[PDB]
Amino acid sequence: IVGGRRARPHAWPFMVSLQLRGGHFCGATLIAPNFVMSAAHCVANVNVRAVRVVLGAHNLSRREPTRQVFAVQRIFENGYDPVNLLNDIVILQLNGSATINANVQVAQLPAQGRRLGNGVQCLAMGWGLLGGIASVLQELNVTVVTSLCRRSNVCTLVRGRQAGVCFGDSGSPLVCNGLIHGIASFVRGGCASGLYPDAFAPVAQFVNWIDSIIQ
Ligand SMILES: CC1=C(C#N)[C@@H](c2ccc(C#N)cc2)N(CC(=O)N2CCN(C(C)C)CC2)C(=O)N1c1cccc(C(F)(F)F)c1
Ligand SMILES: *[C@@H]1O[C@H](CO[C@@H]2O[C@@H](C)[C@@H](O)[C@@H](O)[C@@H]2O)[C@@H](O)[C@H](O)[C@H]1NC(C)=O
Numbered sequence: 001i002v003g004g005r006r007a008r009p010h011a012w013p014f015m016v017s018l019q020l021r022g023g024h025f026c027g028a029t030l031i032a033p034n035f036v037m038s039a040a041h042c043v044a045n046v047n048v049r050a051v052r053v054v055l056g057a058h059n060l061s062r063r064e065p066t067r068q069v070f071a072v073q074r075i076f077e078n079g080y081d082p083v084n085l086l087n088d089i090v091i092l093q094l095n096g097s098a099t100i101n102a103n104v105q106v107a108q109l110p111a112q113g114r115r116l117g118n119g120v121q122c123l124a125m126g127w128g129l130l131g132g133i134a135s136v137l138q139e140l141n142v143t144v145v146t147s148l149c150r151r152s153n154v155c156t157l158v159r160g161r162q163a164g165v166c167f168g169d170s171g172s173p174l175v176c177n178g179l180i181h182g183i184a185s186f187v188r189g190g191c192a193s194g195l196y197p198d199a200f201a202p203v204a205q206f207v208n209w210i211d212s213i214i215q
């Protein structure tokens with residue numbers, strides 16, 4: 001996250017860090033005690049039997065008793081198309097269920113088909129680059145835009161300055177009105193161009209598919 005601020009510790013207890021080889025590589029969202037969702041592009045080209053799913057985290061450089069670590073048992077994807085940057089969504093089934101507490105909570109999703117209009121105020125978050133990787137979870141006020149966005153994305157822009165999501169933020173949730181409306185997918189013109197909206201997988205188009213996977 002470029003140009004944001006520290007989240008309050010455990011402000012977003014659905015926020016997940018996917019790790020490989022002791023390092024964060026993508027964000028994700030806990031959507032049931034035993035399923036996280038992320039971007040398909042994050043797990044394309046990775047050994048998924050090696051991905052560590054970290055719940056309850058805040059400061060990644062610190063040892064945190066609040067953390068709960070899971071392996072991935074299985075993944076599910078619906079038409080992921082890297083060539084057209086479409087359907088950039090994956091559900092990872094964990095090898096167990098999270099203990100649900102103050103630090104670890106299931107996110108709330110929109111109803112299937114719910115569209116966000118131009119100007120809706122959201123919060124993006126993640127442990128991606130600050131412009132230097134982030135140890136502390138960052139969040140950022142963003143605005144939904146329909147300009148320079150296709151139908152197949154939710155897009156957001158920080159109005160008036162250069163700020164947005166960056167490498168390592170992929171897979172992270174976009175929260176609008178308490179609801180997960182996007183999963184961070186791609187940037188244009190580099191991170192925090194000041195011009196191209198950030199693009200998110202549009203979670204609301206996938207809700208019936210998500211529901212049937214999680215039960
Ligand atoms: C990490 C990354 C890429 C990779 N690997 C990569 C990517 C690949 C596939 C999908 C899908 N479906 C989505 C993104 N990506 C887009 C990207 O690198 N390009 C866009 C497509 N280009 C054409 C000419 C083929 C090549 C360059 C990206 O912005 N990013 C990127 C960079 C910074 C932030 C973010 C995110 F998700 F936080 F927005 C994403
Ligand atoms: C579920 O997985 C947890 C984490 O497993 C660790 O990371 C994975 C990716 C492998 O490298 C594994 O060998 C590591 O231990 C375990 O700590 C936990 O016990 C597992 N839960 C089970 C098996 O019920």
Ligand SMILES: *[C@@H]1O[C@H](CO[C@@H]2O[C@@H](C)[C@@H](O)[C@@H](O)[C@@H]2O)[C@@H](O)[C@H](O)[C@H]1NC(C)=O
Pocket residue numbers: 121122123141175176177178179
């Ligand atoms: C910055 O964002 C703060 C939090 O945003 C609200 O809560 C998140 C979880 C989402 O539900 C989002 O849609 C909500 O707007 C706001 O409290 C604060 O007012 C914002 N400030 C500005 C200038 O946008």
